[PDB]
Amino acid sequence: GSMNKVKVGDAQVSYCIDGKGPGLVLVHGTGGDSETNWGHLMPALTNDWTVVRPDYSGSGITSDEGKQLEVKEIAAQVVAAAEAARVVPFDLVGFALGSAVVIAIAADYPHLVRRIVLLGAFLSSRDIRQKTQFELWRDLIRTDRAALSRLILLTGFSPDFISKQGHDGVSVIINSFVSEINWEGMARQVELDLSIDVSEAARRIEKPTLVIGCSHDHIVPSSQAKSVVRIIRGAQYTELHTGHLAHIENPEEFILLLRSFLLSE
């Protein structure tokens, strides 16, 4: 594999390339990065795709000048990494905020994109539940990151999954959030969660689209994913019985959906 960089305006965009085959671009969500969201899946992907994992502003070792985020700029970062990796045309997979970024890329760069998969997806955080939630996340990043780390555990994984991890396993998860999240970057990403609205982009998409909702999702409730499906022409819906962090809780079922939707003729 390789770690690489591409300059995109004021940003030095870090991205991973691994594998061989047609292009698969994986786009992380809020507070996530290429490693924490996808690293554990890699052995099950890299024999079928050339997998490209960019870290957009606020995540990983990607560097920039600290400006407030804009979805078009973030989309351009992902696209620059994919083009530098020479994986055009590619399939796109987005998680949560990264699903809104993938909706922007599929709408505005149609010639680069074959099929898309949107996990834990939303169009905006206009809904009162989401506005309340991400304003709470904003506040806790500023005042109490230990509290937010426990909030994300409790709202981001299914109860039964947490129980299965035990004391030691939950301690690792919590400690990894506290010690490995780029908190200032995550703060910028939460502000984008609050302001983003890719509804108009979604109406412009002309690509095969799979939207994966999560039955227990208490960060991006599955009603949000169903709203994405209604606006994207021909989009298909499927559900994983997990909390928000489906790709962590049920990596195998997630990989099987990617294969079903993307490796099919």
Curated annotation (Swiss-Prot):
Belongs to the AB hydrolase superfamily. Acetate binds at T30, L97, H244. The active site is at A96, D217, H244. It catalyses: pyrrolizixenacetamide + H2O = 3-amino-5,6,7,7a-tetrahydro-1H-pyrrolizin-1-one + acetate + H(+). Its EC number is 3.5.1.-. InterPro entries: AB_hydrolase_1, AB_hydrolase_fold, Meta-cleavage_hydrolase. Disruption phenotype: Cells lacking this gene are no more able to produce pyrrolizwilline and accumulate pyrrolizixenacetamide. The keyword Metal-binding does not apply. GO terms for molecular function: carboxylesterase activity. It holds the Pfam family Abhydrolase_6. It comes from Xenorhabdus hominickii. PANTHER family: SI:DKEY-122A22.2. It comes from the Bacteria. It is an enzyme of class 3 (hydrolase). This is Pyrrolizixenacetamide deacetylase.
